[PDB]
């Protein structure tokens, strides 16, 4: 029976015969619905079966622009008002090739098919078209198997299915549009070694997203219009699934272009993004016919996702090679970074520095956990890109900002200016104000002295830093110093923190370097193993040390074993069975990082059993499966088992000595692999004055920090005997006056908001005990 | 007058009339006016509601310069000199299709229609322009309603309904018809930002909204249209979706809408607004924006993000995710004072910044609900309503503090005279003896904790992280209160004071507290807070609150905001927590002798000392023990009890004065305390063996009203 969209062919002809009042359904109706517009678009125009077939329509086009004009007037109700069965046998008579194509139902040419009996202007010029195979023979030799029932326009476009969601970029390659890509080169050639097996031909990419494995293809193909394809594979062309909605369930539609492409003969390829698909209920799709043997089709993932459903099928695994995609060198960002160079430049109409571009590459590399420097390098440059060259686009919104600065603050002094009043009014605030917009006041005649932009070419550091800056902050450390000079100073740096176990930052100041360099294996953390007590730096140091090192408090994470005596690899996220991803998402949010545990001394057979890997290779496995780079995050380790030896410190013991008294308990505590993994194990000993009163002073340092800084100005005052009755109540033997750091604010700042509250303090008012 | 794209055409008429000099305006004349070339860019060719009505114009292509070549030549002046009202009616002659087709001005149709005479072939072969037939049948095929203004772009299928539900601002914009958003450039230096990116022009405003959202895309188009926006943006525009929902479905016309667009020159970047949807659509409005192209821009919370961004990525592939900030103070008054002038017009009154300031000062803080901006509008607003209200029915028209916070304040919740009067400075200061009110001795946290929760204000430490409270005393010895005396001392309210026992808390109660969305609740912690972001968390048996809750606690401990389990983190810091435990019952008998505190103190938090992860304890701003009634409490405790009897009684209830014994005092004395349960058992009591003992008199009546008894 008839397509929908040949009742679609037969809506316009009647549309026509609607619109166009013709009183009945005749033989050359369906041209007008046949033709789009004098476009080829339809199946039956150009491109068609006619013209090349047999005979060009677009002169039985021509001319029956006036059959189509030559249909008589008629009045409002009666136009077509009759199936007109002279035309109308073809509801029957139409059945003729509807089936012969492999098919359900008639289509378009299909039932133009059975016109070349009915439809047509058989004459001395006999205008009837391709005429006993010719159709047929183009209806098969254009597509064939056209159509199937009522879904997707009838003969659709030129040829027929696939086009729509067929999609080439050998096309865009010979069309110029796609990006020259780099070193995947025999990495392709590896995809291209997968496509010479009459086993499996058939690919899968495994690696991180945004790596370029889609960007990958363009090689594929643009090797492939370089001919680089080789001989079997110079047939095939790009063809990939833009996944489409289903639009009840349609696959059919995704079923549709499986054997039209296996018709197709080799002249392209299948590739497949990321969700092959497993639906959660279709299925099996294509699965069988993909499993055939022929259908060339290429795969790529990253490892959880090729995880999901070839473990369950393994016929992928069967039907497939995986192959990893490495996320490029930083230099091979660097090198195709230049690739879009001038596009994005000229994209973002700017120009660009490698300075910056490489710095990106350079610093962003660490910076941005999950998006890559194989794209988010690029990705920072669109970024660094915009900005810039939007302080270029409207002007700079500086200038459109700096009419926005004093906006309001020019207009919200109204009220302050509208009636004089007893609080804000012109004595100071009035005034006060006036210093913002004065602060405001001075950029315009030396700013506008620059344009009345300039700046292209990226910068290097905004572009980085001001962008970092965006992205992150305190540039100054991501500004200049770059691995090194922290560490010559880092110890003198951290030397800040608490004096004494010096030697231990050393080591530590040493064994970070021990972490670079990659004399020690790049693939492996650095492994640290911490005695002492509370106030003691396992209390403490970690604080410093990202902060030195990743310039942050939060690289720092904490663990409790405490927490885990049993079976947290259960709650380590374990093979979701409920979704533990903690430690995994500790890292997964935090690549770059240092990891605290607590309770070390306790931790439990499960617990360390895990810490080897974490010992080892510096990665982290997940139960779902993942594996995670620990080599570039740093463990940190709470230990107080020689807390007995730890007390005898009294005696200011002989710490190796008492050390080696510890080790063994330790030694007991934990295997040696644990042990012979460790970069350093080191107590936090007794502390002196000379520490106490400055490690006092170093919160008293930093009282400000909100206080006299971001908020009061207060001018500070402490007495040295305060500054020592500090020490003297408040340090605790055991845990330091860490526990009067926590009273602190009691003894000084309420003793300080008492007088707030008075307000004897005004700021710098200051009285003290 | 008529339309400009109509008269574009038309004095392009005229010129056209002029090229070659034309004697006369005449109706075969704009046959190839109406187009520069076959492209639909001129529609009268193809897209001509004729083509498509009756006579299709691709070979009637031939014939329309063919008369304008032949008419006779003329020279300059006499060229468009004439309307030659042949021609000359088609100026009125096009206003007769506005009638049965509903249009108003005269436009590319009409102008087009009146021609439909002689503007032609008429011959007995005559090409040439049906009357009604072609357009009054397309003149709905095109538009269906055409009529806007002689403005504007394409009369002719220019998207496809391209305003059929999305309206331009830059309309607005270029008219000028939207208050400037402020402080928002910032937010545009991220959208100019946001777009350029050939990978993601794609921004998103992600975060609760109501702060005025994509009032901020105002600017932006402003600033498009303002050229404050780049070149790559200029030819760009901005548009905002409005939902033509209705049915099959036509959310095709939504995925119409993108065949206008980005197929319109993607000329345009068309703002969704605040729901991006998985249809709780798989591919809408994706796939061109999935293209690669479609430059559009959405926001949401970032609840949908936190829903439907889980679900794909791509989107976080396709969109830059953006977050807004609800305006502090100043940030606000911007949009106070940027909208004062707004609202007290548009509602017919004036402000002041009296209330203004104050009003988003007190509202942030007593309005505990929406973005503040809106909400201190919204209250000003009603405010400035109430007044108006009060105005008419008109001493003022300016409005100040007062009644425009405090009643509406009051209006909001009550109290004015408290919210009102501090700036927390008393409230401060002389709560010592104010807080001292409740709890007989116990100094030392009255003293402490307001001391300390007045340095818990002030935000001399974190500024986010809250006022941090673990007791020891006896359940019974007002303490609870106490937090709710000093949350309705604080607060102005008891219900500040909320109510988790952590015997209620199992293990996985984690999730009956709160819960990532699945049952699916408000989380209950949260459900209150994220109702009331001003209030106290009083959880006790926190012996029995199982570490697994601390870590939120530990949250709560920390940082003063407060996820929820669907993730929605709320401030803890306005709000105030506070435990107990029951562990020094023990070492209370030490306080039961009222032995040294201290001592058993250091014994005492041994106990708490081993309950938790120290983190835990070391958080809290401090934890007192509640000693046992010195007489000092009881017949304070009865003065309490007396206060709570004249309640409404001996006056506006009972009317019933009343006189006590020291026995009155003593026989409760007697069995005042508890040794436990303290005098929370006795003070159910005066209810029975005093009221009901007087509902003897009362009951009857038995003994007059306002008389004074004991016992
Ligand atoms: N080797 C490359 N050559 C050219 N462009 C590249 C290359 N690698 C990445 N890109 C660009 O990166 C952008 C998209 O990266 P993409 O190829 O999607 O990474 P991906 O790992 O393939 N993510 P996807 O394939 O979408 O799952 C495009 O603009 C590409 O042009
Ligand atoms: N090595 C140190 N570096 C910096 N601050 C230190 C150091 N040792 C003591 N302090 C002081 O202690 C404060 C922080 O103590 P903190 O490290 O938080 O204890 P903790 O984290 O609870 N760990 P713990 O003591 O083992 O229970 C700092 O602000 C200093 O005033
Ligand atoms: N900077 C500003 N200046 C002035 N008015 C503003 C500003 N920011 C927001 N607004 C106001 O915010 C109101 C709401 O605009 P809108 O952007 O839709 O809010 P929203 O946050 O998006 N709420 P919703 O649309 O439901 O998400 C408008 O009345 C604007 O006047
Ligand atoms: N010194 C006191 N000041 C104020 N109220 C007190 C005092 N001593 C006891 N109370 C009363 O003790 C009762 C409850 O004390 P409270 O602090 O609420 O413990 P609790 O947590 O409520 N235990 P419970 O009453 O069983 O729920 C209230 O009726 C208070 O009035």
């Given at each position: ?14 549309k ?30 150009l ?5 090349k077939?047999?005979?060009?329509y ?8 006036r ?53 047509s202007?058989?004459?001395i ?93 363009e ?26 909605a ?13 054997k039209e ?17 497993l639906?959660?209920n279709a ?9 055939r ?14 995880r ?22 930083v ?9 879009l ?10 120009r660009?520095?490698?300075?910056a ?18 794209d ?17 686009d ?16 020019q ?28 602060s ?8 506008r002295?620059?344009y009345?932009?300039?700046i ?8 980085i ?23 010559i ?24 370097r ?10 492996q ?16 140091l970690?604080?410093?040390?990202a ?44 690549p770059?990082?240092?990891l ?65 008294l ?23 000993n ?14 008293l ?5 909100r206080?006299?800084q ?26 330091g ?20 509250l ?5 700021d ?6």
């Amino acid at each position: 029976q008839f397509t929908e969209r040949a009742l679609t062919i037969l809506t316009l002809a009647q549309k026509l015969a609607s619109d166009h009042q013709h009183p009945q359904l005749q033989p050359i109706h369906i041209l007008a619905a046949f033709i789009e517009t004098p476009e080829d678009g339809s199946v039956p125009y150009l491109q068609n079966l006619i013209e090349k077939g047999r005979y060009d329509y677009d002169l039985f086009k021509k001319v029956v622009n006036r059959n189509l004009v030559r249909i008589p007037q008629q009045q409002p109700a009666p136009a077509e008002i009759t199936p007109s069965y002279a035309l109308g046998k073809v509801l029957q008579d139409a059945a003729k090739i509807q089936k012969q194509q492999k098919d359900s139902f008639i289509a378009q040419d299909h039932i133009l098919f059975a016109l070349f009996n009915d439809s047509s202007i058989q004459q001395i010029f006999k205008e009837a078209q391709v005429d006993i195979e010719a159709i047929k023979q183009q209806a098969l030799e254009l597509r064939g198997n056209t159509r199937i029932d009522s879904r997707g326009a009838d003969t659709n476009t030129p040829l027929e299915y696939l086009s729509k969601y067929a999609i080439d970029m050998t096309e865009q390659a010979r069309q110029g549009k796609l990006d020259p890509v780099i070193g995947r080169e025999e990495e392709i050639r590896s995809t291209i070694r997968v496509l010479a097996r009459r086993i499996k031909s058939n690919p899968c990419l495994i690696g991180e997203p945004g790596i370029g494995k889609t960007a990958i293809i363009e090689g594929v193909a643009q090797r492939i219009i370089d001919d680089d394809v080789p001989t079997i594979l110079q047939g095939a062309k790009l063809f990939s699934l833009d996944l489409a909605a289903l639009t009840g369930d349609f696959e059919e539609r995704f079923k549709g272009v499986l054997k039209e492409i296996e018709e197709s003969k080799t002249l392209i390829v299948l590739f497949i993004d990321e969700i092959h698909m497993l639906m959660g209920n279709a299925a099996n799709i294509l699965k069988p016919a993909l499993s055939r043997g022929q259908l060339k089709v290429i795969g790529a993932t990253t490892n959880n996702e090729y995880r999901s459903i070839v473990e369950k099928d393994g016929a992928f695994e069967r039907r497939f090679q995986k192959i990893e995609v490495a996320e490029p060198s930083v230099r091979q960002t660097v090198a195709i970074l230049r690739g879009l160079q001038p596009k994005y430049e000229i994209h973002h109409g700017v120009r660009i520095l490698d300075s910056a571009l490489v710095t990106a590459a350079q610093l962003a590399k660490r910076y941005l956990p999950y998006r890559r420097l194989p794209d988010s390098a690029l990705d920072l440059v669109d970024i660094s890109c915009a900005g810039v060259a939007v302080a270029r686009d409207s002007k700079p919104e500086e200038l459109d900002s700096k009419e926005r600065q004093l906006q309001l603050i020019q207009v919200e002094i109204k009220a302050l200016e509208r009636d004089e009043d007893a609080d804000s009014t012109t004595k100071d605030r009035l005034k006060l104000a006036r210093q913002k917009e004065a602060s405001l006041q001075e950029e315009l005649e030396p700013l506008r002295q620059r344009y009345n932009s300039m700046i292209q070419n990226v910068v290097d550091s905004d572009t980085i830093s001001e962008t970092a800056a965006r992205l992150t902050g305190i540039p100054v450390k991501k500004l200049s110093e770059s691995e090194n000079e922290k560490l010559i100073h880092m110890e003198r740096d951290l030397s800040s923190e608490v004096v004494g176990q010096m030697d231990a930052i050393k080591a530590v100041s040493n064994a970070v370097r021990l972490s670079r360099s990659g004399l020690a294996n790049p693939r492996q953390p650095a492994s640290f193993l911490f005695l002492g007590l509370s106030g003691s730096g396992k209390t403490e140091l970690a604080k410093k040390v990202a902060g030195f090192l990743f310039n942050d408090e939060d690289m720092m994470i904490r663990v409790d074993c405490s927490e885990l005596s049993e079976k947290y690899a259960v709650s380590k996220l374990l093979g979701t069975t409920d979704e533990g991803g903690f430690l995994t998402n500790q890292l997964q949010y935090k690549p770059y990082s240092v990891l605290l545990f607590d309770e070390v001394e306790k931790a439990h057979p499960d617990v360390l059993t895990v810490m080897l890997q974490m010992l080892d290779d510096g990665r982290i496995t997940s139960g779902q499966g993942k594996t995670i780079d620990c080599s570039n995050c740093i463990v940190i380790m709470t230990s107080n088992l020689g807390a007995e030896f730890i007390n005898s410190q009294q005696g200011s013991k002989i710490q190796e000595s008492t050390k080696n008294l510890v080790m063994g308990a330790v030694r007991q505590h934990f295997r040696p692999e644990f042990l012979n993994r460790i970069s350093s194990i080191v107590i936090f000993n007794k502390l002196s004055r000379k520490a106490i009163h400055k490690i006092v002073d170093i919160r008293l340092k930093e009282i400000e920090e909100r206080f006299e800084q971001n908020d009061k100005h207060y001018k500070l005052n402490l007495t040295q005997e305060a500054k020592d009755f500090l020490a003297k109540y408040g340090y605790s033997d055991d845990m330091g006056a860490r526990p009067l750091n926590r009273l602190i604010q009691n003894e000084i700042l309420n003793k300080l908001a008492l007088r707030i509250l008075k307000n004897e303090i005004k700021d710098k008012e200051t009285v003290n005990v």
